[PDB]
Design brief:
The complex is a heterodimer of chains A (108) and B (313). With 108 residues, chain A is mostly beta strands. Chain A contains one helix and six strands, in the order E-E-E-E-H-E-E. Classes of the chains: A mainly beta (108), B alpha+beta (313). Bound molecules: ligand TAK. The ligand c1cc(-c2cnn3cc(-c4ccc(OCCN5CCCCC5)cc4)cnc23)ccn1 binds next to strand 1 and strand 3 of chain B. Chain A: GO terms for molecular function: calcium channel inhibitor activity; calcium channel regulator activity; FK506 binding; peptidyl-prolyl cis-trans isomerase activity; signaling receptor binding; transmembrane transporter binding.
């Protein structure tokens, strides 16, 4: 599925994101070489996206949907569930696998 | 709540990178306000506020790429450079979106067509364009800095009129960047033909010399200056809107058309006699002429034009 999840610290092991819920996360995104490209932590502002509304790359949502409330985890996303062959100009190169350190802060 | 809040820490000009997708998918397209070979520009809405969405034709994928890259790698916020919000790819074949501040007055080209200008507005327009172009052209070092940028397709259609009476420069898809991380310039005759400097038309430009590209922009800016000054009233008199070289080339001119006018015949737009009875238009005519020297090295810098326009005002 191009999304591998490596737990860093557990969540409540009970509350997982459901359709239509707003996921509230902190994330730090890096390329495979470790270079950081985006970080909600650096801006001190949590990122929010609605489950099932396609408001984030497929890999990120798929990984988050497997996390329970309060969990923190490393999501590795292959290009086919991220930005593909084009990438995102000036940020993500072609065929990039991306690593996100994600914390699921809340579900609203 | 508002897009301004979301914009109010890191790098690039617009929304945080992952947030660009989120906002782009939350946008509703309302009406097409522009259509061309570039693709389309639409008015759209995000949570009840207007934004502009440029949807690129597949012929222009490379401009989307370059413009997106520039805005995402350079901090390019400035009153007179079109404000970038986000870029997104969306399968709808994949569509390429560039999302920006919406300006309901449209382009300077359209505005000049059925409006004439008082002195205040003429000066505000041309000063604002100069301010934007100087900001593009100048390299700023340090953590709050930017590389120098040359636009390469400056014209009245690629400038938008803002409600406060200033303009902003848009359409950075052909632009080139110059920094200290100086490899070769990443790029010959790419722009709009009617606005091409002699050295573009005869291909004498040294393609690895950034300065040379700035001087090409200055030629085109002189032409924009002329377009605008024609529409300023003096002593009850004004000229109709015309594009540069309207009297000697056809619509959609060829390279050969332009080369013959600009290089071989050394022609320049004519200054109407009525301008010499007005101190502002007299100063603008002088300024124009100093953007149109055949020798690029003699042309004024954007910053010099800005400072001069600041003293006429
Ligand atoms: C080029 C242009 C634009 C753009 C931003 N606002 N905007 C507005 C218009 C516009 C043009 C004509 C209009 O008629 C009323 C209304 C709006 C056209 N283009 C743009 C955005 C990106 N690239």
């Amino acid at each position: 599925m191009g999304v591998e999840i490596e737990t860093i610290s557990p969540g409540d092991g009970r509350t997982f994101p459901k359709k239509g819920q707003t996921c509230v996360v902190h994330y730090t995104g890096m390329l495979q070489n470790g270079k950081k490209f985006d970080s909600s932590r650096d801006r001190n502002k949590p990122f929010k996206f609605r489950i099932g509304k396609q408001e984030v790359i497929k890999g990120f949502e798929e990984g988050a949907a497997q996390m329970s409330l309060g969990q923190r985890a490393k999501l590795t996303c292959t290009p086919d569930v991220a930005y593909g062959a084009t990438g995102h100009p000036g940020v993500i190169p072609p065929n990039a696998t991306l690593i996100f350190d994600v914390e699921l802060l809340n579900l609203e | 709540s508002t897009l301004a809040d979301l914009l109010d820490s890191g790098s690039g000009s617009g929304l945080p990178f992952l947030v660009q997708r989120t906002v782009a998918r939350q946008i509703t397209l309302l009406e097409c306000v522009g259509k061309g070979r570039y693709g389309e520009v639409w008015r759209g809405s995000w949570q009840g506020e207007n934004v502009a969405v440029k949807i690129f034709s597949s012929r222009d994928e490379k401009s989307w790429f370059r413009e997106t890259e520039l805005y995402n790698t350079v901090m390019l916020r400035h009153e007179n450079i079109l404000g970038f919000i986000a870029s997104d790819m969306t399968s709808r074949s994949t569509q390429l979106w560039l999302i920006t501040h919406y300006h309901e007055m449209g382009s300077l080209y359209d505005y000049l067509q059925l409006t004439t200008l008082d002195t205040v507005s003429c000066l505000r327009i041309v000063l604002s364009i100069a301010s934007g172009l100087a900001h593009l052209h100048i390299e700023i070092f340090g953590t709050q800095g930017k590389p120098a940028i040359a636009h390469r397709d400056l014209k009245s259609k690629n400038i938008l009129v803002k409600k406060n009476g200033q303009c902003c420069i848009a359409d950075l898809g052909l632009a080139v960047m110059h920094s200290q991380s100086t490899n070769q310039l990443d790029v010959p005759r790419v722009g709009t033909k009617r606005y091409m400097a002699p050295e573009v038309l005869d291909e004498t430009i040294q393609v690895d010399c950034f300065d040379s590209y700035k001087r090409v922009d200055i030629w085109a800016f002189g032409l924009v200056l002329w377009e605008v000054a024609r529409r300023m009233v003096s002593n009850g008199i004004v000229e109709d809107y015309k594009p540069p070289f309207y009297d000697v080339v056809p619509n959609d001119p060829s390279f050969e058309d332009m080369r013959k006018v600009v290089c071989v015949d050394q022609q320049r737009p004519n200054i109407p006699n009525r301008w010499f009875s007005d101190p502002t238009l007299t100063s603008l005519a002088k300024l124009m002429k100093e953007c149109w020297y055949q020798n690029p090295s003699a042309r004024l810098t954007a910053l010099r034009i800005k400072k001069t326009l600041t003293k006429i005002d």
